[PDB]
Amino acid sequence: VMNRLILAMDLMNRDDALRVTGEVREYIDTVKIGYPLVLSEGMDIIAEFRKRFGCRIIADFAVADIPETNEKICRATFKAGADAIIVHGFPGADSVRACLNVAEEMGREVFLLTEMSHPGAEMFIQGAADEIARMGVDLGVKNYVGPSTRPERLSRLREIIGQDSFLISPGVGAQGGDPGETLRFADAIIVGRSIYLADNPAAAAAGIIESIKDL
Amino acid sequence: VMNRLILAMDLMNRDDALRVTGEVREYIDTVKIGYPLVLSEGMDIIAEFRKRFGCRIIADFAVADIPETNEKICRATFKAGADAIIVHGFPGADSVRACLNVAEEMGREVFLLTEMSHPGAEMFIQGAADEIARMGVDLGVKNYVGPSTRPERLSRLREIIGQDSFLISPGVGAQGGDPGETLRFADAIIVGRSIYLADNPAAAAAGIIESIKDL
Numbered sequence: 001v002m003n004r005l006i007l008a009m010d011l012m013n014r015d016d017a018l019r020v021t022g023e024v025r026e027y028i029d030t031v032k033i034g035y036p037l038v039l040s041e042g043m044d045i046i047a048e049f050r051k052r053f054g055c056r057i058i059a060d061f062a063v064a065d066i067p068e069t070n071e072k073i074c075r076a077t078f079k080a081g082a083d084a085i086i087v088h089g090f091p092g093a094d095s096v097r098a099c100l101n102v103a104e105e106m107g108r109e110v111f112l113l114t115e116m117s118h119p120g121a122e123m124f125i126q127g128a129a130d131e132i133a134r135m136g137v138d139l140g141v142k143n144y145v146g147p148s149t150r151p152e153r154l155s156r157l158r159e160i161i162g163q164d165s166f167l168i169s170p171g172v173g174a175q176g177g178d179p180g181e182t183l184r185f186a187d188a189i190i191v192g193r194s195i196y197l198a199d200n201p202a203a204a205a206a207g208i209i210e211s212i213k214d215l
Numbered sequence: 216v217m218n219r220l221i222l223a224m225d226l227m228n229r230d231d232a233l234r235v236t237g238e239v240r241e242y243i244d245t246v247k248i249g250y251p252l253v254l255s256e257g258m259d260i261i262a263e264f265r266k267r268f269g270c271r272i273i274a275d276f277a278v279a280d281i282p283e284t285n286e287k288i289c290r291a292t293f294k295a296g297a298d299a300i301i302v303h304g305f306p307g308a309d310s311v312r313a314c315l316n317v318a319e320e321m322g323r324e325v326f327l328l329t330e331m332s333h334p335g336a337e338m339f340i341q342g343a344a345d346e347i348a349r350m351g352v353d354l355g356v357k358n359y360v361g362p363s364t365r366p367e368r369l370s371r372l373r374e375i376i377g378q379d380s381f382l383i384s385p386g387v388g389a390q391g392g393d394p395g396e397t398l399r400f401a402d403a404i405i406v407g408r409s410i411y412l413a414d415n416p417a418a419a420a421a422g423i424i425e426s427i428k429d430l
């Protein structure tokens with residue numbers, strides 16, 4: 001992705017979301033849109049963004065249901081024009097396979113969320129995350145998400161998925177993660193609040209890119 | 216809930232969803248609406264249903280993000296008129312507490328999904344589910360979801376949460392669960408396809424209720 005930086009656009013107002021995304025568009029190639037924006041403004045916002053900004057859109061829907069419901073969520077999400085969807089691994093292989101089947105049908109991609117970035121991830125997800133990643137490899141998953149806030153776990157995840165797999169990583173900035181350290185292991189970093197809550201989101205994005213280029 | 220039966224309305228067309236819900240409204244008082252319907256027809260469908268049918272609405276959004284994102288999802292979902300939201304416990308206590316805080320602010324309820332009903336739940340979720348349920352109890356959660364497809368696990372869940380907690384259970388019918396056995400432990404059953412894919416959804420609901428009344 002352009003500059004190895006993905007904008008997490010979690011503003012909950014179409015006007016603010018459009019303003020900030022337009023201000024930082026020169027510095028990115030992909031926008032992650034999640035439920036805060038979609039549930040506030042509708043699924044139509046995905047195709048609006050994709051057209052207006054000519055960016056790729058990852059739907060961060062943390063898909064975490066039974067196989068049959070997962071298939072329906074993926075179908076609706078790709079129909080809305082998303083390029084990829086983020087799916088939890090913790091509910092197991094059949095739930096992940098359902099999403100992979102729809103992505104295959106529709107010519108799109110699945111990202112598998114292994115370990116989450118927030119403190120509570122330590123309770124249950126962290127102890128299963130290596131096995132969730134290995135499950136991903138066995139299912140043929142090629143795109144993964146893992147935590148900026150724990151670079152030793154990001155390293156272990158990269159070890160499991162290999163160098164050919166694509167790995168993106170949230171928790172940079174607001175949650176405490178560092179762009180340069182995270183990019184030792186991940187291919188791209190996700191950044192939300194550090195950019196979209198900044199007084200000057202373009203300046204915040206540019207500052208991040210400047211530290212990335214230096215690596 | 217009326218007749219201990221909650222309709223899982225996962226049709227993805229407003230006209231079909233309205234038809235079936237109207238046909239079975241005499242047999243229920245609560246409708247579970249999830250992402251298949253919401254992502255196809257918009258969040259406004261929640262208030263439409265609540266008004267048209269005068270039913271309680273549980274938003275089954277399997278909420279499974281970091282605390283800050285969970286808060287935004289819950290806020291948008293209650294603003295849309297939902298009475299309650301279903302939240303995963305696997306991501307940990309901070310993520311669950313975020314949802315509880317918004318529910319407290321807005322006068323609504325959180326249901327904690329412990330163990331899921333599909334086969335893949337056995338991989339990772341089942342081994343954590345007793346601890347997820349105990350975490351719920353410690354956080355003061357009073358409403359829980361657990362699997363019709365494993366009544367021995369539903370029994371263990373009920374043991375952890377006590378008799379005062381409210382427990383609803385999906386996986387009845389299509390996934391293999393039985394209404395009567397599940398209601399030995401759960402307060403209410405969730406039923407989707409066995410009703411909404413039936414040639415006569417009212418007859419399917421009535422058939423289920425006749426077997427419930429007999430218990």
Ligand SMILES: N#Cc1cc(=O)[nH]c(=O)n1[C@@H]1O[C@H](COP(=O)(O)O)[C@@H](O)[C@H]1O
Pocket residue numbers: 008010034060086113115116117118145147170171172173174175190191192193194280281284
């Ligand atoms: N993908 C994802 C997800 C999984 C995870 O483990 N940690 C995250 O922060 N996220 C999402 O990434 C973004 C992080 O944004 P921020 O830079 O912390 O403001 C949010 O959309 C959050 O919901």
Ligand SMILES: N#Cc1cc(=O)[nH]c(=O)n1[C@@H]1O[C@H](COP(=O)(O)O)[C@@H](O)[C@H]1O
Pocket residue numbers: 065066069223225249275301328330331332333360362385386387388389390405406407408409
């Ligand atoms: N709530 C929930 C959820 C958690 C779980 O462990 N198992 C489920 O089936 N569900 C949901 O309950 C409904 C079950 O519907 P059905 O009766 O199997 O057609 C679906 O909306 C499914 O997504």
